[PDB]
Design a protein around this ligand. Sequence first.
Ligand SMILES: *[C@@H]1O[C@H](CO[C@@H]2O[C@@H](C)[C@@H](O)[C@@H](O)[C@@H]2O)[C@@H](O[C@@H]2O[C@H](CO)[C@@H](O)[C@H](O)[C@H]2NC(C)=O)[C@H](O)[C@H]1NC(C)=O
Ligand SMILES: *[C@@H]1O[C@H](CO)[C@@H](O[C@@H]2O[C@H](CO)[C@@H](O)[C@H](O)[C@H]2NC(C)=O)[C@H](O)[C@H]1NC(C)=O
Ligand SMILES: *S(=O)(=O)c1ccccc1S(=O)(=O)F
Length: 218
Amino acid sequence: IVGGRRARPHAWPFMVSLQLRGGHFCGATLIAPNFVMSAAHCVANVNVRAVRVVLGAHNLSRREPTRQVFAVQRIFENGYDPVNLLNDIVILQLNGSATINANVQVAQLPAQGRRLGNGVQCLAMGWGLLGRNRGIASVLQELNVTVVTSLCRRSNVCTLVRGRQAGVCFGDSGSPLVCNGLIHGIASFVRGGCASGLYPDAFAPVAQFVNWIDSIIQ
Ligand SMILES: *[C@@H]1O[C@H](CO[C@@H]2O[C@@H](C)[C@@H](O)[C@@H](O)[C@@H]2O)[C@@H](O[C@@H]2O[C@H](CO)[C@@H](O)[C@H](O)[C@H]2NC(C)=O)[C@H](O)[C@H]1NC(C)=O
Ligand SMILES: *[C@@H]1O[C@H](CO)[C@@H](O[C@@H]2O[C@H](CO)[C@@H](O)[C@H](O)[C@H]2NC(C)=O)[C@H](O)[C@H]1NC(C)=O
Ligand SMILES: *S(=O)(=O)c1ccccc1S(=O)(=O)F
């Protein structure tokens, strides 16, 4: 996240860190005690058997007793297009079930086909790059963004920060877009580089996949 602010500890207890060798590389969302969702391109060309699913994290540089760590058991994708980044969503079944508490919670998703119009106010979040030559963030970041429909495909939800250069960046991919308490997006791609102030950020449209998601997580 470029141009945001520190999230307060465990403000978003559905926020997930996907890690290789103890290293964050993508975000995700807890959508059931034993399932997370993230972007498909995050687990493409990656050894998924080595990926750790980290719940209850806040600071990537500290030892955190609030964490619960799982592994990936099953993978579900529904027509993911690696060229056009269509259907850039993956569901990952965990090798166990999370203990639901104050710091680890299941996100709420919208109804199937639910659409957000221009101007709606949302919150993006993630541990991604803080800016050019600044590296990924230790502390979970959040960013007020606004839904836009210009420069956006009907198969995405797109957002832009008005008035300054801000947006999601490398490392934020897979992270939830939250609008009115519901997860409407999964960070999918940027254009013209991160925080260009010109191209909106693109999210996988979670609402278009709700029936499919439910048929898996029941
Ligand atoms: C910046 O965003 C915060 C947080 O946004 C709301 O909550 C998110 C989780 C998500 O659901 C968004 O779609 C929501 O817009 C805003 O804080 C809200 O602020 C109002 C007062 O203006 C307050 O009554 C609400 O309780 C706040 N909600 C939360 C969860 O804190 C804030 O207003 C936004 N500010 C700007 C300038 O964009
Ligand atoms: C689910 O998979 C995780 C991933 O390894 C298991 O977690 C570890 O738990 C063992 C206990 O046997 C510890 O020795 C390791 O240090 C843990 N690893 C990490 C990275 O935390 C977990 O036990 C599995 N749960 C079930 C129910 O199978
Ligand atoms: S991801 O958040 O879409 C992302 C953003 C900015 C640069 C690269 C990436 S990546 O595709 O995950 F690498």
